Subunit: 244 residues, 2 copies
């Protein structure tokens, strides 16, 4: 695993696509302001509505039965309408329950999105909110996949971590974690993929003729700055609970 | 702005990317036949296939927040459309989503996916919905090309429209060299995603555009222009 490296890459690619598509629209402030829209029968903003309704539909087809899928509205999980899949046994049962979506929500809306977009309003609230939901779900999956990354690192050499864990020494755990290949050189790699989206095979365009609005270097810096620290926090949180 | 000839041209080329990427996402999962069978699952209060359910539910959500008020956005289930002047009013009547639905599910999807069942009914159907919506927007987009072309040079079409000569209009809209380059570009865009053989088969993407996407857009354009003098 290895088998995880390819998973991580797809998760990264999915985030890059989502950010790129969201960046096709402006900030569109009313999308996030419940006092700008009175959504009939619902208390909350348009993005909250779109996310809540999306999770309702996705829960019905068993999305959150998967070990890598975490709901932003866990207290509103809708009943599935498909036969249940076998429950995953890969992660440590005591450590697998981690859900930091509240942190991911505030990161996206407050730290990432305002830097990602032009602050004006182009009126495309519907499109923006749907892009937002895709961003949120893709960010959540990548960030929480730290549980699988950490489990892999642990299983390779448990004694490497077991002393730190018994001591609840989060700083030491962090220092024992290595971040290589996909976990490194993130800014440039993400920037390069954002630039390459929509290109023909081996087509190399100058910045002059970019067909999408997103700033590729900005996308890479935002991903490294705001996405990567949260996924390391998840790895540390997972290992702290790995002997629970 | 969004519907000048130049802006439309660039939108169409962005939609190439959107469609190829949507297909790529769907092709990460197998055909998963129970997704398309009415008899497979017990959906309470619903008659139809899972993909039908997922699309209907998604159209209900999106209609509520005004998606189908956009002239380029066309529901697959207008009879079930729930409550929330670029084009001639005749555009509102033109919607060939039934043909797009059949093409996607019965022609494209078996070619796109591995024939078996990997159990991922939820992911597959969510991906189906995005493919369908992207195909629909692109194919119906012709409306904007036709309107911008008519606005710029009405005398080019007015005679054919007065004569209701659809074939003549179709010839006017056909640029074979341009179409050949679209096919080439789309295949190469698919090819750019590389191998997992290919993640999204270049020849399949090229064929989709040549056999279906460009012919059906033309069919929409002719249907629109024929009614443009009403
Ligand atoms: N872009 C338009 C129409 C639209 C496209 N996709 C949507 C999805 C949901 C709601 C609206 C839309 C809007 O935001 O209103
Ligand atoms: N793998 C399951 C559950 C699932 C995982 N991710 C999803 C995303 C959307 C819907 C469902 C899912 C399925 O595809 O059915």
């Amino acid at each position: 695993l290895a088998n995880i490296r390819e998973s991580l890459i797809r998760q990264e690619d999915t985030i890059i696509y989502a950010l790129l598509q969201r960046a096709q629209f402006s900030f569109n402030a009313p999308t996030y302001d419940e006092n700008s829209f009175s959504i009939p029968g619902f208390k909350g903003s348009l993005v909250e509505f779109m996310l809540k309704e999306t999770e309702t539909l996705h829960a019905k087809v068993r999305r959150y039965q998967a070990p890598d899928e975490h709901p932003f509205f866990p207290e509103d999980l809708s009943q599935p309408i498909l036969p249940s899949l076998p429950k995953s046994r890969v992660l440590h049962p005591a450590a697998e329950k981690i859900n930091i979506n509240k942190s991911i929500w505030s990161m996206y809306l407050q730290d990432l999105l305002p830097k990602l977009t032009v602050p004006d309003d182009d009126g495309n609230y519907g499109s923006a909110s749907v892009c937002d939901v895709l961003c949120l779900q893709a960010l959540s999956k990548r960030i929480h996949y730290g549980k699988f990354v950490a489990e892999a690192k642990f299983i390779e050499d448990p004694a490497r971590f077991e002393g730190h864990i018994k001591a609840q020494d989060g700083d030491a755990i962090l220092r024992e974690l290595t971040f290589k290949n996909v976990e490194d050189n993130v800014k440039r790699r993400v920037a390069n993929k954002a630039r390459a989206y929509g290109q023909e095979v081996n087509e190399h365009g100058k910045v002059d003729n970019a067909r999408y609005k997103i700033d590729p270097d900005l996308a890479g810096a935002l991903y490294e700055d705001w996405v990567m620290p949260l996924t390391k926090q998840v790895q540390v949180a997972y290992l702290l609970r790995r002997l629970d």
